[model samples]
Target: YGLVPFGKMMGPWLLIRSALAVGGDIATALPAAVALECVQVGAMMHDDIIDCFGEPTAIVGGDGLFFHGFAALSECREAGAPAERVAQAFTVLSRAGLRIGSAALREIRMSREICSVQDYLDMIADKSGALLWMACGVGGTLGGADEAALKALSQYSDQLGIAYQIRADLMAYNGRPTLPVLLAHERAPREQQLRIERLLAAPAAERKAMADLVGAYDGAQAAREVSHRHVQLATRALQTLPPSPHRDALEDLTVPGRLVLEHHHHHH
Candidate 1:
């Protein structure tokens, strides 16, 4: 309840959109939405501790949140969704969790190594993209969207996941080097690379210096440009879907930096 990241809402909200976009009932998607959120909340709780806090309580409590996510999928059948689709939802959540697990491991490995920008992008596609991909996948499953629609939705959300994470990385640049930092180091000369690597280890010395390096090297801008490309790609993927306010909401929801989420105003 305390988490403020817009992602907290995005996972479930995307699920809700999946159902509605197909003119599916809200009740059919509600429990699945809860299932989608629990996995994320569970991840965030443990991720916060694993990445920094290190308390066992946070570790143990995190499991219950994830375990309950499956429980909610069971509830989805009771919400009038089919058993087959509910099972599909189960598969979606399970695979998403596994993908996130491996991606989380990759991030831990990255903390010790200055990997390539390609490595970072791969990591985020699984780490961030999979869950959003899952949300849309589950929505299409229960909402009865066709295979083509599911593919398009998955592609759209996957691109959005990349866009969402890159923007988050840029915003946190005021604090962490993140993707831009890696890119800055990538494009820099050997001597400048050493300076960035040093900052990467102990950024506490001068956030401003790191910021300058990234800006000077066009690293931040590259990250922004890449993020922009994904957003465009995300919208491009949406073209196949038939028009609906839901599709429009999905397209317009996370527009660039001034991102304003489009609420469901008109019911189909």
Candidate 2:
């Protein structure tokens, strides 16, 4: 949990941890799980720096964390994990990193312009969903899960990742452009839409009003529905698995559609 901010660090860890628990083995999977955390937090640190949203020291910190992620891979070998499994784990992480990198680049470009809902979802699927998918995939691979189980877990994680990103966008009201903001701009009355455009053009100055306008135009509600739909999809994917406390835990994480409502209540 301390691996990253916002409680999101647990996402990969939970998937790996639960899978390993199901297999009755913990030691060998530890390194891979830890590596997942390192990669996740490392990416976040890099993003903070790229976005210029964190301290200067974050650059150094991010580099160190990224290095540590690969370093942890060696521990998998030391734990007597099969060499093939260790190599596969590294391969998964590397592929996920590539997708995340490309998506981050796309997001930066989109941030400078108003992106469509499809554009935003596609970016996040690669950017945010990649790591979670890798986590579950590596976990199942290491746990010796069957191909069907692995596929199910991968699907669940992908949907969960999409839902997570949507929820984050919906909760954030810092006036930075997001999918919901774009939706509001597109759907609002002409006068309101123009106002939103002006707010986006000078986002820093109109931070407070952006939230109001999004809510007024029902963008907030629409985003919430989208998020909930993803959550339900994630839950359905998990249902194909054999019932267990671990599987139940994964479903619980994606269910309980009150997250947006709870956040709104707290902030308002």
Candidate 3:
């Protein structure tokens, strides 16, 4: 809720003002600005749904579906809602769902062998960065910000986007997995693909044991190190923006996130 209002209102205003300060045309920026908001909403909704089990919320709701054991079809009976309203929600969700799914599947299918640090960052940038970039993009579009400003904002949002996900992934593992893995770990991309080859492509039970072993291998320190790196990168990226009250305010927004990781690390 807070991010949306900030992204939708504050971001756009800053974008517009920055554009005007640089002598850009507002009329040229309008469509792209509005479109960016649409893209952000669609992307964010997709991200939340991915945190679930891809089960439409009308059927199975919450992060529990993916992380916990929730029977798929059987739960449908208990999770009741109006057909028409559910249909509408599905219509909206499905549109975004299809696009996101296509991108994910393509990445998995095409790039199964590589897992460089840059690759990991790019994946998060695509899945998570797009929304924040859209905020800046829409602002530029609406306020006729220059291409240079848009480009700078894109880099800024990419860093911020990955940081946001690093924060989420840090939360998800409860501080166990390497923060990089929590944010961008894909099985085939990791060296585990070799394990998959070595273990006779092991049965589900055996593989899950292996998975548990891998999950436990990384400790809290690994998470903190990676998370802090992203936060540092995010701050560096922010430096590219022009000096303004809005930029200062934007930096302030990152405080809670830094404190979240810091406090979590300090206590543990």
Candidate 4:
């Protein structure tokens, strides 16, 4: 029961951890699973802190604790743990941490730069695609799946995550008066879209102006488009797989990548 979120979120690696726990002829797969979980939680924690909201108790809370312990240790020390040693640890953590944050910011920036659907696709993939990639390695090893299978699944999940986030965005903005493309002065229709741009670009800058323009907008439409596109990408990734239940399960996992948008679409 406790393992549901851990296992499910780990994608496929949960199976690998149990195999290791069985206590006979274990493989290096355990280490991979543990390491993958560490990286995932570490990334998520750092991401949450950057995004400004999260339950610190879950995911990277331990990493947060370590920093506190490090702070205390450093306080007791004279030269701050030799500088180089501290640098090494932070250097590694910061690389993973900032890369993810940069990708997310890139998407928000793209929301301002979008000229076409492809641009939107690229934005979402970078923002959410990264974590999905990490999960694939963990899930594959635990399932006793091969590297080839892992690659396919990673791509599949990457598309899934992108599709999911896009839909969520649409739910927030679709029916709203402001289209971000116009609000941000990207390439939106000059005729009807100009209205959104004009309101948002107004010099007065009321606190509620932007929201008022695009507030009713929901992401349901944009999300559906992204979901359909990613599903196609996922389907293409499965071409390498042979006929088998694992292959079927992979497809099943991806099918919902778009279906999640259906709920939002109809309701909207």
Candidate 5:
């Protein structure tokens, strides 16, 4: 039971969804979606081993998944992709891994430091944003989309990634300050900054204390507002695509109902 489900299928779901929306051959795209999940979930395994020390063998699992991912991707040719597109798929995933790896390193650098809200968001954009961007780009590419469609796919995923991260962080705010709490700290007059900092860094105040401070400081609300905005922008990006059931599925993803349900169940 220790090897629980690695994480959400959102990334894979998005890949399939985008591929369908763009009218790609489903058979050709299938392996790529599987490969996306493999590589992403693999890295996630590596992710926790570094910090949470949840399990060292999880790293081995990641290595396994990674090899499987690369192998699965090569199956694109089996699915009928020509040389250049398969090669294109290869670069898309590889560069994405690099971006995620780089952003994670920056995230490690960010730990324990009180950086500006913008800086935090940038790291998130590169980290989560890059991951989602890769998912969408690969989806669009496999679907045989043109440059403009690819641009739209990337745009939409980038917004969704930031929005999703902010929402998750907001949901967890009462447990301990997250992005919303940090934003609250960023905006507060210096007089109240120490209070918020001490509360977060030191022993967690009984939940009520932190709640009132964050609530009074208008911390979480701002995060919700920001989250909604990104969701809207992400939704708008889809207008570039022609209407279809698949596009509808992609749009539905912006609503909290789907993403939140899974995230709520998984929150630790």
Candidate 6:
């Protein structure tokens, strides 16, 4: 199928695993962790097919990844987790997968549609946020978290997922189209908006010029502020959890300055 690994997925996969590891014993988290990671990787494989080539080969590859994730559900039982917990975790993963597909389809359908910022946000919530919430929820369940802790972690995951998506959208300014780019165009001055519209109509090769343009007009800054707010919200959600090393680790993920610094260093 000529499939190549997605380099960007490494960071996210590790980050999620670390979060789960911190919250739950390694043995307990392993099954759910592997399941969630497999689903995420599979989702990306499917996305590659949708966004790049819709070959039958890619479809077969995607199917292989997706069912492989489902196959991992049995590992939860093998790991000594309660049957009810295993069933619940499986349900969460299944629901998340369904939402992921629906969200991807919605985004594809609306690709050429000019939508509001709120609409953009809702779409990402379905796409990026659903799986994140499931990951955390599964971790919390396996870790024996009480209802309160589970709720807090779920909220944290939702906010973090939104922030992550916002960050991704901003990064796309370097050489791609994103929800923020569309929103920025809506906010630009009349003449500049027309210019941006023209640029949006062009190929991604031409869109590479938009990074500097967005920076020049402070469009990127505006988007950054939005991402920053979501980060703050996610961090606050972590505060609801009892103090622990795991809670601290989760909070670290929401630090806007740290993320920006890391991003800067990585890019440079």
Candidate topping lDDT: 5
Instruction: For candidate 1, write residues 1-268 as lDDT tens digits.
Output: 2222242336677888887887678888888888877777777777776455446656776788888878887888888888887887777678877888999888776774477777788788888788688788888778877778888887787788788788777765513336777777767789988877765564455646766766667776657777888898889888888888888778864465223231111000
Model 4 per-residue lDDT tens digits across residues 116-179: 5555555556555655554443334333445576566557756766665554555455121212
Query: Candidate 1: global Cα-lDDT?
Result: 0.73
- List RMSD in Å for every model shown: 5.8, 5.0, 12.9, 10.1, 4.9, 6.2
- Per-model TM-score, in order, reads 0.84, 0.80, 0.51, 0.55, 0.85, 0.78
Task: Write the residue-wise lDDT of candidate 5 on 1-268 in tens digits.
Answer: 2223334536677887778888888887778888887887787778666555336568888889988877888888888866676777778778877878888787776665466777777777777777787788888878877778888887788787787778788876612235887877767889888877766553444637777887788877778887888888888999999899878777766666454555642232
Model 2 per-residue lDDT tens digits across residues 121-170? 87777877776776776777666666677778767777777887777776
Superposition-based RMSD of candidate 4 using all C-alpha atoms, in angstroms: 10.1
Give the least accurate 10-residue stretch of model 4, judged by summed lDDT.
17-26
- The TM-score of predicted model 3 comes to 0.51
Q: Report the number of the highest-TM-score candidate.
A: 5
Error of 1 at 218 (Å): 3.7
Report the error of model 2 at residue 10, Å: 1.7
- Pick the winner on TM-score between candidates 3 and 5: 5
Indicate the residue-level lDDT of 2 in model 3.
36
Residue-wise C-alpha lDDT for candidate 6, range 1-268, written one tens digit per residue: 1222222322233334434543555665666666666666666667766655447756676677667666775576777766676676666667767777888877777764456788777777777777577677667766666677767776677777677777766765512346667667777879877766565444666665767777776666567777777888887877777777666656666644344434332222
Question: What's the ranking of the predictions by TM-score, best on top?
Answer: 5, 1, 2, 6, 4, 3
| Model 3 spans > 4 angstroms off | 1-37, 44-103, 106-114, 174-216, 255-268
Model 1 alpha-carbon drift over 4 Å, by segment:
1-9, 53-56, 174-177, 201-209, 257-268
Question: Which of candidates 3 and 4 reaches a greater lDDT?
Answer: 4
Comparing 2 and 5 on lDDT, the stronger one: 5
Task: Point out the worst 10-residue segment of candidate 1 by lDDT.
Answer: 259-268
